[PDB]
Ligand binder design. Sequence first.
Ligand SMILES: [Ca+2]
Ligand SMILES: [Ca+2]
Ligand SMILES: [Ca+2]
Ligand SMILES: [Cl-]
Length: 237
Amino acid sequence: KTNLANEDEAYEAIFGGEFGSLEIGSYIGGDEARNSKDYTEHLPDAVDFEDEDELADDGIVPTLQNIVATVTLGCRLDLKTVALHARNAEYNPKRFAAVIMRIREPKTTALIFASGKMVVTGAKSEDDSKLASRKYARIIQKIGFAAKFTDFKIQNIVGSCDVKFPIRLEGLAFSHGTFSSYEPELFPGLIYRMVKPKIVLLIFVSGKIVLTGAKQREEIYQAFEAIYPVLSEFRKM
Ligand SMILES: [Ca+2]
Ligand SMILES: [Ca+2]
Ligand SMILES: [Ca+2]
Ligand SMILES: [Cl-]
């Protein structure tokens, strides 16, 4: 039985899929702009904090596509109060037990929970992730909660790579049987579960690779360097 209106289930759903927080995009929809009755209500003089500038006190190469980070604000939050006091906040308690808040620089989304736990996504660098998180913590402080920027941690780094050559997925799936899963009628990519580093690679026919599960960017580079000779061996000539 699934109920993402429950705080714990909503938090765990972010990191609990088959690919974990790779699929965080499923939970940051907030309100549907095209749906007229779906808009988050705000107080008449609610401030838009999306331009927040203040910070709470503290060859082939893969590219970083996304960084997911966690922050402990250290205080309980009334999510309905946060939503009403911030025009850049979206809150649908019946669908997901978090306030969805967005800022423009670095362009990110925060998932803010009643316990004061926060998840920040959308950043392309560790410094941007930390900068955005410190801004969300400041916004919560400005609304009036005794929030603190603590326990910043990168939970996931998504990498993407294009090897610029097609891949023989049948032979790669057969040859690396124990570490691969390939069901092309169910999902187009070959799922490669690397042991060391512990990284999931999504290998597509086009030579486009997606790497997920890293908590350090060095793991993305290591996984790509490890898989590159395998991809070259299975190049479709
Ligand atoms: Ca939306
Ligand atoms: Ca709504
Ligand atoms: Ca297999
Ligand atoms: Cl083959």
